[PDB]
Ligand binder design. Structure first.
Ligand SMILES: Cc1ncc(C[n+]2csc(CCOP(=O)(O)OP(=O)(O)O)c2C)c(N)n1
Ligand SMILES: Cc1ncc(C[n+]2csc(CCOP(=O)(O)OP(=O)(O)O)c2C)c(N)n1
Ligand SMILES: [K+]
Ligand SMILES: [K+]
Ligand SMILES: [Mg+2]
Ligand SMILES: [Mg+2]
Lengths: 362, 329, 329, 363
C-alpha cells in the first residue's frame, strides 16, 4: 500500500520585478500524480501516432508536434481551472486535449474527417474547444487576442484569467509589445507565457533575439522564469501566477523553459540547426514523462506496475482513436459552404465557376 | 428634423449600448477627447471608462484585443481613426475575425464591429486618402457596408452591432457634417437596415447609376442636371458592399438597359470591376444596350494641391460625361 | 535541359547578387536554413552575412527595414515566408514603398522587391491559403507580377531586381518543384522579361483563355483535351498583374470572339473582375459573341479536408466546363 | 563694446540607462554658433506662426502640425550631426526640413500647395524630402523601421554615417518600434532612436497611454538617455555624444527629448480640452527655447539684446517675403497630375475619373 502524497523540491524561479516567487517546495498527491501521468502519456502517444499517420500521408499540410512540451500543457491545465481561458499558436494538440477534447476528435481533424472536431474544416492548427481559442497559425497574432480575452474576464467580473502563449521566435512580433502595454495599463487578468523551446522554426533563440531573457521582455510587467520540463514547477508557477491575476495586480510574464523533440512541422528533418544527439541528450536526462515517473516510483506514490497498466490503457485509447479517424468519412462535399456566418438565414456561395452553387447555413 | 450623418452614428451607438451591456467601444480619442471627428461625443460621459475605452496608438494590438473580446462573448465596436490606419491591423481583421467561424466549423463566432472614415477627405494627401471598400469586400467571412446619408448610417451601424459576424462599416469623413432629414421611423431606437439590401434613391428609366458612400450624392446631383434635359437616371445606393445586392441592380438594368457605376476609390479591381463582372455573368447582361462603364478616382496616389486633388475624385462633371457617352445622347 | 521553378528563381537572384553589390536579400529562415521553400539555396554559403540576411520573426519591422535600405539607395529583396504574412507588413509595402516616388515629387525612388509563395498550397487551410494578386494589383506605384513556369520566374525576377520601383512577386508554392524546358536563351545572365507584357502560350482560334500563376498549367491541359474535339484555345499567360497587358487580351478576343478568365484567388473583386470590366469598357466588347466568364477559386476561406480543398480551387474539369458553356458546344 | 568669443554654460545632466558616463554637464558655446543657432530657432518659430496664420486663412489645407516650442529639438539635432548623416521623422517635420537644407520659400509653398513648393504641390505638410532627410511621414511608427534601415544602409556602405529616427510619445506604443529595437540591437546598426516626448499623443496624455513614461528605458536592452528638450544646448551636447557612440561601432542608442508643443495637436485641434492655457503659459515662461538661449547669450556677453533684436526683425522680415511668394506662386499644372508614379520608366498613360480622361505620366 502506497504513500498518499509526497513533498518534492522544485527549482527556485528567476524573478523579474517581484519580491517573492512561487514556493520551492510542493506537495503531490498519488491521485494527481496518476492523473497527470495518464495525461502527459496520452498527449505523448497521440503525437507518436499523428507523426506516423503523417508519414503514411493519411494527414496533410501542417502538423507540428509538441513532445517534450508535455510538462507545459499538463502543468498549465493543472494550475488553472475549467472556467479559465487558454489561447495558443499552432502547436496545439496537447492543450486541445487537456481542455476537454477526446483523442478520437483530435486525430479525426488531423486526418480531415466529418467526425473531427472542426468538422474537417481547419486541420492541425485550428482546433477550438470550450474556453480554448486555438489554434492560431499567424505567429504572434494570438497575443492581442488573449489580452482581449483577459479584457472580457475583467469586464464580466467573474474573476477568471487568461493564459496566452507564444513561442520564443514569436517574442519579437510587434503585436506582443503593444499587448504588454494595454495589458499593464488596464491591469488585465492575462498571464503571458513564452514557450521557449530554444528554436524559432530553424533559427535558435540567440540568432534572432537581442536579449534571450523573455521573462524580462515585458519590462514594466513583472515576469518569472520556469523549468517547463518538470510538471510540478509548471503547476506551481501557474497557480502562483494565477493567484496574482485573480487578485487584480494585472498581467504577469511566464518564461516556460522547454524543448521540442521533433523538428518544426513534419517537413523539417529537424537536424540542420541542431545535432540529433543534443535532442537525444535532452530526451535521456530530462524527459518530462520520465521525470514524473522517477518521482512517483521513488517516493512510493505508485508502482512500476501501475504506470505500465496505464501505458497499456493509453496504448489502447490511441489505437482506437487512430482507427476511428482513419476509417471516418470525409465531410460531404455539399457542406463546403457551411458556417461562413453565424446566425444568418441560408444563402448561396460560388464554386470554381458560376454554375457550381453551394448552400451555406450557419 | 434634419440630422447630420455624424449625429446618426452617435445616436445608434448610444441606442445599442444602452440596450445591450455586452457592447462597448474602443479606439483612440473616443473617450474623453469625444472621438477624433467627434463622432463618439458625450458617450464617454454617459457610460464611463468601463464601456468607452481610450486606447494607445496600437492598431495591430487593439484590433486584436477587440477580436479577443468578441470571441469571449463581448460585442466590441472597434474604431480606427481612418481606414488607412487599419492596414496595420488588417491581419487581425481578415485572419482572426473573418475566417474564424468557418475554420472552427461553426464553433467560434466573432461579433465584432470595425468602423471609421474611409476614402478621400480634403487635402489629407496620399497615406490618408485611400478607399478600402475593394480590399475588404474581397474576403469571405466578412460583411462590408458603406453608408451614404443619415438614415443609412444609423440603420447600418445598428444592424452591424446586432450581426454576429465581423462587419466593416466604412464611413466617410466629409459626410459627417452633412445634414439630411430623418424620417420618423429612423428616430425610433428600433431602426435597423438590412445588411445586403440596396435601395433606389431615384426612380428612372434611361440609365442605372450605381454607387456607395459619398459619390451617391453626386449621382443625385448629376441626375437633377440630367433630368432637366429629359434623361431620367435611376440612382441606386448600394449600402452593403459584401453581400452586395446584385438582384436589385439587375432588376434595374433589365429596365433601363444602361449602366454607369461610380466609386470613390482606384479603378483596377474596384467596386465597379465587381459590379460589371457580375452584370456580364448575370441574366441582366442580355438586357444591356451598351457597355456598362465605370467612374472612379484617378489611378494615382491622392495628390495635395487643390486642382490636383479635385481631378482625382469623380465630379458631377464626370458622371454626367459618362452617362452621355453611354446614352450616346 | 529541365529546370524547376525553384532553381529558376535561384539563378535570377544569384545573377543579380553577382552583378550589383548594392542588392542584398533578407527574410525569415533565408540564410542558413537555405530558405523556407529552399528557393535561396546556397546563396548564404556564397555571399555571407552582409548580403543574405536572416531576420527575426518581425514582418512589419523588416519590411520597413527593407523599404528604408532602398530609400538610402540599396536594392533589397525582401522575402516573406508567404504573402499571408505580408498582411502584418502591408502598410510598409503600400504607404512607404509604393506612394513615395509620387508624394516625394519624384525625389525618392524606392527600389524594393517583395517575393514569396502566394495563393493556395496543399492542406494548409484558411489562414495560409490566401491569394493576394487582387490586393496588390489595385495600387499606384506598385508593379505586381505573378510567374508560372521557369522561364517566367528567372526572367520576371531578374527584371524586378533591375526596376527602380516596388515590385511584388507573387510566386507559387506548388510550382517551385515542377521542371520545365529551359530554352538556351533563358540560360543567359541577361534574360529579362519586360513587366507589363503578357505571353500567348498557345495559339488557337475558338476562344481566348487568360489566367496567371499556376492555373496557366491547367488551361494548357484543359486546352490539350479540347483540341481533341477540334476546339482551339488561345491561352494567354498574364505574367504581370499591374500594369496588366490588356491589349494582347483584346487582340486575341478580336480573333476569337470569346473570353474566359481563370484565376486561383477568390471571386469578388478578383483578377477576373477587372479583366472583364476592362473588356466591356474597351474596343473588344462588340466582338464578344458570348459573355466572358470567370473561373475562380471558391468563395469560402480555404477548407482543410482534401475533398473540400480540391473543390475550392479550379480543376481542369471546371475550366473545360466553362469553355463548353461559352462556346455553347 | 567687446563681445566674448565664447562662454561655458552648465546643462542639465541626463538620466542614464545602461550607460557608463553620459554626456558632460558643461559645454563651450562660441559667439558665431550662438548667433546662428538663434537665427535658426527664430526662423522656425516665425515660419510656424506664419503657417498658422495662412492656415486660418484657408491658404493651407489638410494637415498642419507645428513644431512651435520644440525648436531646441531640430537645431539641437542639426547641430550635433554632420550634413552627410541621416534623419527621418514623423509628420511634424516643418523644423527639420529647414534645418536640413530646405528653404522657407520651398516649405511655405508646399504647404500652400504650389508648383514651387518642394514636392511640387503633391505632398502637403507631411511629405517633404531633402538631401538625407527621408521626411515626412504620416503613419505613426512607420518611420521607425524605415530609419533603422537607412541606418543598415550606412553600415552596408561602410561610411561611418548614422541615422536619426525620431518618434513621439504617442508613437512609442507601436509594435514595430519594438521590432526595430530588436533588429538594430541585434545587427548593431548605427541608429539613434529618439523619442520626441512633448507630453502629448494627440489629445491623450502620456500617463493614460503608456504604463511607463520612462521612454528612454522603453528600448530596454538598448542603452538610453533622457534629455532637456527645451535647452538647445543639451540636445546638442547629447546628440553629439550619441552620434559618437553610434559612430564608434557600438550599435544603437535611445534618446528621450522632453519638450513641448505650444499649439494643440494640429490646426483643427484647439489644444485646450486636455490641458489648461496656464499649463502652456507657465512653460513658455520657464522653458521657451529662444528666450532661454537669449538670456544665456546676453548674460555671458556673447551678444547684446539690440543685436539679437536685429536678427528678430530680419527673420520676421524674411518669413513675410516667403509667404508673399507662396500665396503669389501659381498652382501646379493639371498636365502634371500623373507625373512621377514610376521611376526610370518610359512615359505612360493613367486613368482619370473615367476612361476618356487620360493623364500623361513621366518619371
Ligand atoms: C506572422 C508569421 N510569420 C511567419 C510565419 C511562419 N512561421 C510559422 S511558425 C514560425 C516559427 C515560430 O517559432 P516559435 O515561436 O519558436 O514557436 P514554436 O514552433 O517553437 O512552437 C514561423 C516563422 C507565421 N506562421 N506567421
Ligand atoms: C498608424 C497610425 N495610427 C493613428 C494615426 C492618427 N494619429 C496621427 S498622429 C497621432 C498622435 C501621435 O502622437 P505623438 O507620437 O506624440 O506625435 P506628436 O505629439 O509628437 O505630434 C495619431 C493618434 C496615424 N497617423 N497613424
Ligand atoms: K456585431
Ligand atoms: K529593385
Ligand atoms: Mg520556439
Ligand atoms: Mg507628442
Amino acid at each position: 500500500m502506497f504513500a498518499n502524497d509526497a513533498t518534492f523540491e522544485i527549482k527556485k524561479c528567476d524573478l523579474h520585478r517581484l519580491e517573492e516567487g512561487p514556493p520551492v517546495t510542493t506537495v503531490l498527491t498519488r491521485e494527481d500524480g496518476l492523473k497527470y501521468y495518464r495525461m502527459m502519456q496520452t498527449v505523448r502517444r497521440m503525437e507518436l501516432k499523428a507523426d506516423q499517420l503523417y508519414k503514411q500521408k493519411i494527414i496533410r499540410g501542417f502538423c507540428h508536434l509538441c513532445d517534450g512540451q508535455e510538462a507545459c500543457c499538463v502543468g498549465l491545465e493543472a494550475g488553472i481551472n475549467p472556467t479559465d481561458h487558454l489561447i495558443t499558436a499552432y502547436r496545439a494538440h496537447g492543450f486541445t486535449f487537456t481542455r476537454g477534447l477526446s483523442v478520437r476528435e483530435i486525430l479525426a481533424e488531423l486526418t480531415g474527417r466529418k467526425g473531427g472536431c472542426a468538422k474537417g474544416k481547419g486541420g492541425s492548427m485550428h482546433m477550438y474547444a470550450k474556453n480554448f481559442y486555438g489554434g492560431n497559425g499567424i505567429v504572434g497574432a494570438q497575443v492581442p487576442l488573449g489580452a482581449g480575452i483577459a479584457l472580457a474576464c475583467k469586464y464580466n467580473g467573474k474573476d477568471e484569467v487568461c493564459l496566452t502563449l507564444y513561442g520564443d521566435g514569436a517574442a519579437n512580433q510587434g503585436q506582443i509589445f503593444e499587448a504588454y502595454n494595454m495589458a499593464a495599463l488596464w491591469k488585465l487578468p492575462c498571464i503571458f507565457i513564452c514557450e521557449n523551446n530554444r528554436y524559432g522554426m530553424g533559427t535558435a533563440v540567440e540568432r534572432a533575439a537581442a536579449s534571450t531573457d523573455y521573462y524580462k521582455r515585458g519590462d514594466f510587467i513583472p515576469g518569472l522564469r520556469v523549468d517547463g520540463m518538470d510538471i510540478l514547477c509548471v503547476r506551481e508557477a501557474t497557480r502562483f501566477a494565477a493567484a496574482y491575476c485573480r487578485s487584480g495586480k494585472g498581467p504577469i510574464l511566464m518564461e516556460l523553459q522547454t524543448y521540442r523533440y521533433h523538428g518544426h512541422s513534419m517537413s523539417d528533418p529537424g537536424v540542420a540547426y541542431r545535432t540529433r544527439e543534443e535532442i537525444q541528450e535532452v530526451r535521456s536526462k530530462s524527459d518530462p514523462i520520465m521525470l514524473l515517473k522517477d518521482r512517483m516510483v521513488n517516493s512510493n506514490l505508485a508502482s512500476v506496475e501501475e504506470l505500465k497498466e496505464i501505458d497499456v490503457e493509453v496504448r489502447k485509447e490511441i489505437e482506437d482513436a487512430a482507427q476511428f479517424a482513419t476509417a471516418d468519412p470525409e465531410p460531404p462535399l455539399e457542406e463546403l459552404g457551411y458556417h461562413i456566418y453565424s446566425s444568418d438565414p441560408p444563402f448561396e456561395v460560388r464554386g470554381a465557376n458560376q454554375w457550381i452553387k453551394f448552400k451555406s447555413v450557419s | 428634423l434634419q440630422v447630420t450623418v455624424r449625429d446618426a452614428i452617435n445616436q445608434g451607438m448610444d441606442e445599442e449600448l444602452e440596450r445591450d451591456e455586452k457592447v462597448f467601444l474602443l479606439g483612440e480619442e473616443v473617450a474623453q477627447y469625444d472621438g477624433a471627428y467627434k463622432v463618439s461625443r458625450g458617450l464617454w460621459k454617459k457610460y464611463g471608462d468601463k464601456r468607452i475605452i481610450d486606447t494607445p496608438i496600437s492598431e495591430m494590438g487593439f484590433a486584436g484585443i477587440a477580436v479577443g473580446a468578441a470571441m469571449a462573448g463581448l460585442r466590441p465596436i472597434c474604431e480606427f481613426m481612418t481606414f488607412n490606419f487599419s492596414m496595420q491591423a488588417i491581419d487581425q481583421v481578415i485572419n482572426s475575425a473573418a475566417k474564424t467561424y468557418y475554420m472552427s466549423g461553426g464553433l467560434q463566432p466573432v461579433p465584432i464591429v470595425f468602423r471609421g472614415p474611409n476614402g478621400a477627405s480634403a487635402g489629407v494627401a496620399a497615406q490618408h486618402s485611400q478607399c478600402f471598400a475593394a480590399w475588404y469586400g474581397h474576403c469571405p467571412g466578412l460583411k462590408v457596408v458603406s453608408p451614404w446619408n443619415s438614415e443609412d448610417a444609423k440603420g447600418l451601424i445598428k444592424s452591424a452591432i446586432r450581426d454576429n459576424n465581423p462587419v466593416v462599416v466604412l464611413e466617410n469623413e466629409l459626410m459627417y457634417g452633412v445634414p439630411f432629414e430623418f424620417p420618423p421611423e429612423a428616430q425610433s431606437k428600433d431602426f435597423l437596415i438590412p445588411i445586403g439590401k440596396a435601395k433606389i434613391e431615384r426612380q428612372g428609366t434611361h440609365i442605372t447609376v450605381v454607387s456607395h458612400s459619398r459619390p451617391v450624392g453626386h449621382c443625385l446631383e448629376a441626375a437633377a442636371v440630367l433630368s432637366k434635359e429629359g434623361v431620367e437616371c435611376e440612382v441606386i445606393n448600394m449600402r452593403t458592399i459584401r453581400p452586395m445586392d446584385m438582384e436589385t441592380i439587375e432588376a434595374s438594368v433589365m429596365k433601363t438597359n444602361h449602366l454607369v457605376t461610380v466609386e470613390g476609390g482606384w479603378p483596377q479591381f474596384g467596386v465597379g470591376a465587381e459590379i460589371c463582372a457580375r452584370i456580364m455573368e448575370g441574366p441582366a447582361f442580355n438586357f444591356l444596350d451598351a457597355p456598362a462603364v465605370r467612374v472612379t478616382g484617378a489611378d494615382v496616389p491622392m495628390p495635395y494641391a487643390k486642382i490636383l486633388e479635385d481631378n482625382s475624385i469623380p465630379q458631377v462633371k464626370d458622371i454626367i460625361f459618362a452617362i452621355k457617352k453611354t446614352l450616346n445622347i
